[PDB]
Write a protein that binds this ligand. Structure first.
Ligand SMILES: Nc1ncnc2c1ncn2[C@@H]1O[C@H](COP(=O)(O)OP(=O)(O)O)[C@@H](O)[C@H]1O
Lengths: 201, 201, 201
């Protein structure tokens, strides 16, 4: 009942930072190592980062890493890089969780899922995270996901299997914006499903 | 999916500060301008402000405005005044949200609602925020409210219509105090309701 | 509608610090005095403490007490000791809540309940706080608790009555770790239960 295994978080924006902070606080278990990959820096509009003391201009994943000082008994590594089909070498570990909103990320998300699964990682990603507050956050394997959701339809057409999707099913093309309470709820459910997948071994 | 519209928050105490922080974190939507109006300063008992970096003696609205630096892509204006009949003219914009407490607040709430409706704003306020933690938070138009609630009964007797009320329906006369978990639930629901009224405009 | 009564929190680790912070934030009621008793210092791994500005090496109860400065409307008495049979007289107040961190806590929890009851205090403790996110948190009197849970069975074997238990039912021996969202939910429910037991104080 000690930390075991490695989780890679691809995306450390408003959702991925929340999931990083949830995973870093797990005790009596959880991952022994967390890798967080994103090449973006803290901007004025990253209020959740700034309220925790991040400075404008800092890489988001360096701010995160800094919360794990010398005596921390799990390792947290911030990798300040944007993932393209050619730096997939940074993808490995036991669970790979991709958290970037929108449809502009789906080709890379699909490349990361394939690369991770062929190295034996379990994979998880989102199916829409928009919403004003009380929207149901649901969890589904890709083969049971609703084909009317364009993210599930695309991953199905790309032949993805054995892949967990989490979210509200509301997308950038729906009316709702992105709100902090919905991202807290998605991050809490993401964290639970990551732990279930880390139990796998 | 960009910020649009103006919301005025009257009251920036334990509840209104949480609503302001929720709206300031909305992406891909939410208001373009937030005006927060309260005369009071941070005191030692305002622990939620102190835990987020506020200094005792700072006006509550100046602390909130200070989170919106020059690069922030919405405008947040802190007005360090209590609303009275003399400066009702500070109330403007598309949605006015009243979250005040302390002494006799129903008469000025009624005045703010009458004036904001004259100016064409949509209006929302609270119908009791007391509770020890798991009390249901409900949302009603005033003329559909549960007639046992004494805030709705007062505003109905003052001829208020077309007004949204959110709360637990526990009030100062009930035995329960004000707890932080109930305030977070109230502020999440108020935020979602504000977004619905901003759309409607 | 002012603070009244005394709550003693035995344990100020990841769960007891959240319960202290909830009780410290209550407005228009709650306890007038909170006695927090723990002998432990903040370590690198106490991220929730460090994120709120605690320094490594500080006593957890003294960091907590430092939030209740001279202007604060309640007193917090941070007692930097562990409870043993030799210093049970430190337990006092109207409500005593045991949330002791580290495991192996049931013999001393039984002693604390017997002595608190002699003093006329109401008592509450946990029945398992492990969980990955959405586990039901339940509240039960010890004579109605399920004796298949080993904590309930032990305390029933030690002849404990008139004592509330709160938790998820998942223990150190189940697979699930301790996650921050489950500790938030357990502390929110414990805070509500403490305020019900405080009624009349
Ligand atoms: N007429 C008014 N105009 C603006 N703000 C007001 C007025 N009357 C009260 N308030 C503000 O309402 C806020 C209530 O905050 P608080 O006491 O923390 O209670 P709550 O937890 O209900 O929000 C205070 O900051 C107070 O200054």
């Amino acid at each position: 009942k000690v930390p075991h295994g490695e989780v890679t978080l691809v995306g450390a924006g408003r959702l991925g930072f929340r999931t990083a902070l949830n995973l870093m606080q797990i005790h009596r278990g959880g991952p022994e190592r967390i890798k967080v990959i994103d090449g973006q820096k803290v901007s004025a509009d990253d209020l959740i980062f700034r309220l925790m003391g991040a400075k404008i201009g800092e890489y988001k994943v360096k701010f995160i890493e800094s919360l794990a000082c010398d005596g921390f008994s799990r390792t947290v590594q911030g990798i300040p890089e944007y993932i393209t089909g050619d730096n997939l070498r940074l993808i490995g570990g036991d669970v790979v969780c991709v958290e970037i909103a929108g449809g502009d990320t789906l080709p890379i998300t699909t490349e990361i899922i394939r690369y991770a699964q062929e190295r034996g990682a379990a994979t998880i990603s989102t199916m829409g995270v928009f919403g004003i507050g009380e929207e149901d956050v649901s969890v589904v394997d890709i083969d049971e996901a609703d084909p009317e959701n364009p993210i599930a339809a695309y991953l199905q057409a790309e032949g993805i299997h054995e892949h967990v999707l989490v979210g509200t099913g509301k997308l950038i093309r729906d009316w709702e914006p992105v709100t902090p309470h919905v991202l807290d709820r998605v991050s809490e459910v993401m964290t639970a499903e990551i732990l279930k997948l880390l139990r796998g071994a």
